[PDB]
Design an enzyme around this catalytic site. Structure first.
Site, short mmCIF file in Angstrom:
data_model
loop_
_atom_site.label_atom_id
_atom_site.label_comp_id
_atom_site.label_asym_id
_atom_site.label_seq_id
_atom_site.Cartn_x
_atom_site.Cartn_y
_atom_site.Cartn_z
CG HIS A 1 -0.53 0.22 2.52
ND1 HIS A 1 -0.27 1.49 3.00
CD2 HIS A 1 -0.31 -0.62 3.56
CE1 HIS A 1 0.14 1.41 4.26
NE2 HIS A 1 0.11 0.13 4.62
CB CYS B 1 3.50 0.89 7.17
SG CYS B 1 1.80 0.70 7.81
N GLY C 1 3.69 6.15 9.43
CA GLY C 1 5.06 6.10 8.98
C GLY C 1 5.81 4.85 9.41
C1 JJO Z 1 1.72 2.05 8.96
C2 JJO Z 1 1.97 3.35 8.21
O1 JJO Z 1 3.05 3.81 8.14
N1 JJO Z 1 0.85 3.93 7.54
C3 JJO Z 1 0.89 5.14 6.77
C4 JJO Z 1 1.99 5.65 6.08
C5 JJO Z 1 1.84 6.83 5.33
C6 JJO Z 1 0.60 7.47 5.27
C7 JJO Z 1 -0.46 6.95 5.98
N2 JJO Z 1 -1.82 7.42 6.05
C8 JJO Z 1 -2.22 8.68 6.68
O2 JJO Z 1 -3.36 8.98 6.72
C9 JJO Z 1 -1.17 9.65 7.27
C10 JJO Z 1 -1.45 10.78 8.03
C11 JJO Z 1 -0.19 11.38 8.38
C12 JJO Z 1 0.75 10.54 7.78
O3 JJO Z 1 0.13 9.57 7.17
C13 JJO Z 1 -2.69 6.38 5.49
C14 JJO Z 1 -4.22 6.34 5.66
O4 JJO Z 1 -4.67 6.17 6.74
N3 JJO Z 1 -5.08 6.43 4.50
C15 JJO Z 1 -6.53 6.33 4.53
C16 JJO Z 1 -7.36 7.24 5.43
C17 JJO Z 1 -6.83 8.30 6.15
C18 JJO Z 1 -7.66 9.08 6.93
C19 JJO Z 1 -9.02 8.81 6.98
C20 JJO Z 1 -9.55 7.76 6.26
C21 JJO Z 1 -8.72 6.98 5.48
C22 JJO Z 1 -2.19 6.04 4.07
C23 JJO Z 1 -2.00 7.00 3.09
C24 JJO Z 1 -1.52 6.55 1.87
C25 JJO Z 1 -1.23 5.21 1.66
N4 JJO Z 1 -1.42 4.34 2.62
C26 JJO Z 1 -1.87 4.72 3.79
C27 JJO Z 1 -0.31 5.79 6.70
#
Ligand code: JJO
Ligand code: JJO
Lengths: 305, 305
Positions: free
Chosen positions: A41, A145, A143
């Site tokens: 992802h 993941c 971050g």
């Molecule tokens: C485990 C991990 O590192 N997850 C991760 C990594 C980068 C981005 C993100 N997301 C974020 O939302 C975020 C906020 C600050 C930094 O990162 C997610 C995510 O949760 N996406 C869906 C979502 C968010 C909010 C509401 C509903 C749905 C993400 C973004 C892009 C790709 N994958 C995950 C998490």
């Protein structure tokens, strides 16, 4: 003497952590030989996560769309493949710090160390267990993941976990290093509920032996029981059934302490039915279930790597 | 989300561990630049430990009497000095893996990570606090002496502890890296008793803020208190007095959560007077006191190294 929740030394794994950035998303990857492993992802936007079609999203991705960074140097990506829920990024250069390693899929109840990382950089190490509902109770922020879980026997790192998701209840789900999730979880932002978080009976017993070895003896009762009778009590308290395989695994700790496994079982039954009465065991007021019999022997023998 | 007892990544310290053998005794040493640091009782026999005169025992020791081993290669000792309770062994070669480092003497209540080693080889890593009675509650077997405790800020390792002794009650005592024991303990096998093991109040409060940040809120009561009133309760329960300095340190966690420090103090008072009623906070049934306010901010922010 003394008994601590002990993680493996993390140096061999620290040398394997890189940062992976694709489009807008940055997370961690694991660099072993000439392959970087990371959660697939990484290719998703935030809105993709609600209902992603990974094969379709991957059509839009070429080798040069994955930025792979080791410290302040960029690795050259020369191929990529999706295997289940992980991406494999083939790079120009073999990690010079690659340890002897294996990929293993662990069983519920087995423990491992997690090296939590952010932007490819190690932030801390702690000890986890794969819960019977196939979650882990970790410490993971956005971050994190792509951080991995592992065991070390000697010079050989056995990777067993890569972090992918946080459920709405704040517990964690992820895959083995072949990309297969533990349990029924998926890499989508959807309703996923965990299942009963039962207690790992054989580990509790192992930890009670560790307590006796360290001089904590007050809970040793005057009773014994049978596997069937104990298991009737285990059911009531949401404990995993104790099998003969488990009794066998506890044999060396029974030998070290002179306490029969079923005698310890009866002590555990008394603790479940009557509580700890405000006492502690090895500094805890709960029955701890994230040490395996192997963990106890290791810590109590001074096994090194 | 999630909150774990988290140690620092140990790789920078693993590269510093060597084995030191003098006569019959083998323990661990710390190799930084061209100096190996180890406990001075490496020069003692078992019977010397009952009443050792280290300066006299040292007359019988030359450079070549200290065998220093890094993996399977021997370091050449070209000088040695006793500084308080540590030996400094000058060697032919600077450790090529020497990180940026400092020696610090920590305060009771401050935390650090321990890399437990045997025969110069790392066996595991866990998180400790310097107790108010200047013991630590570690996991140390025979052969672990010379293992070190440390913090990392960035690329800089701050060494604060070297392991020397286990008291008869199974708690641990040791020195800073200048060889001065924490507390009144000495490197003799004699009657030494610890003192009251009081609870690190400011850390409990930090951990309660961590609980709120992670969604554990049930303990938040409807009361506030004053520093003086709370401290009357702290005395009764063998808690360390809470000072205004401590309130200041908790400021950022109060800001993050919107919960005034004295409001959290009143919640803690209710937990002390009434217990947890069989509930848990962040997976514990005890009030945990080995996270500092800095630890909580670090874990809850994703601070990396
Ligand atoms: C485990 C991990 O590192 N997850 C991760 C990594 C980068 C981005 C993100 N997301 C974020 O939302 C975020 C906020 C600050 C930094 O990162 C997610 C995510 O949760 N996406 C869906 C979502 C968010 C909010 C509401 C509903 C749905 C993400 C973004 C892009 C790709 N994958 C995950 C998490
Ligand atoms: C922290 C640590 O590593 N201590 C250590 C290291 C090597 C030897 C020993 N001693 C042992 O007794 C021992 C047994 C198996 C391996 O080591 C001690 C010691 O305890 N000496 C005094 C003693 C022992 C038994 C009864 C009464 C008194 C030791 C030996 C030599 C030098 N220093 C310590 C401990």
């Amino acid at each position: 003497s003394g008994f601590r929740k002990m993680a493996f030394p993390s140096g061999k794994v620290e040398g394997c952590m890189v940062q992976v950035t694709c489009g807008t998303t940055t997370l961690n990857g694991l660099w072993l030989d000439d392959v970087v492993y990371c959660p697939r992802h990484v290719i998703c936007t935030s809105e993709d996560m609600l209902n992603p079609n990974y094969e379709d999203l991957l059509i839009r991705k070429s080798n040069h769309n994955f930025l792979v960074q080791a410290g302040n140097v960029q690795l050259r990506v020369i191929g990529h493949s999706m295997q289940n829920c992980v991406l494999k990024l083939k790079v120009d250069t073999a990690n010079p710090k690659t340890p002897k390693y294996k990929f293993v899929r662990i069983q519920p109840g087995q423990t491992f160390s997690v090296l939590a990382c952010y932007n490819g950089s190690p932030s801390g190490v702690y000890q986890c267990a794969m819960r019977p509902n196939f979650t882990i109770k970790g410490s993971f922020l956005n971050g994190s993941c792509g951080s991995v879980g592992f065991n070390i026997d000697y010079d050989c790192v056995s990777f067993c976990y890569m972090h992918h998701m946080e459920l709405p209840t704040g517990v964690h789900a992820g895959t083995d290093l072949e990309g297969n999730f533990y349990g029924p979880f998926v890499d989508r932002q959807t309703a996923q509920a965990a299942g009963t978080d039962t207690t790992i009976t054989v580990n509790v017993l192992a930890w009670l032996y560790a307590a006796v070895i360290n001089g904590d003896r007050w809970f040793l009762n005057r009773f014994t029981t049978t596997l069937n009778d104990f298991n009737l009590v285990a059911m009531k308290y949401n404990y995993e059934p104790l099998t003969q395989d488990h009794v066998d695994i506890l044999g060396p700790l029974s030998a070290q302490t002179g306490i029969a496994v079923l005698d310890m079982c009866a002590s555990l039954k008394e603790l479940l039915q009557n509580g700890m009465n405000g006492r502690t065991i090895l500094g805890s007021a709960l029955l701890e279930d994230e040490f395996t019999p192997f963990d106890v022997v290791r810590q109590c023998s001074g096994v090194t790597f």
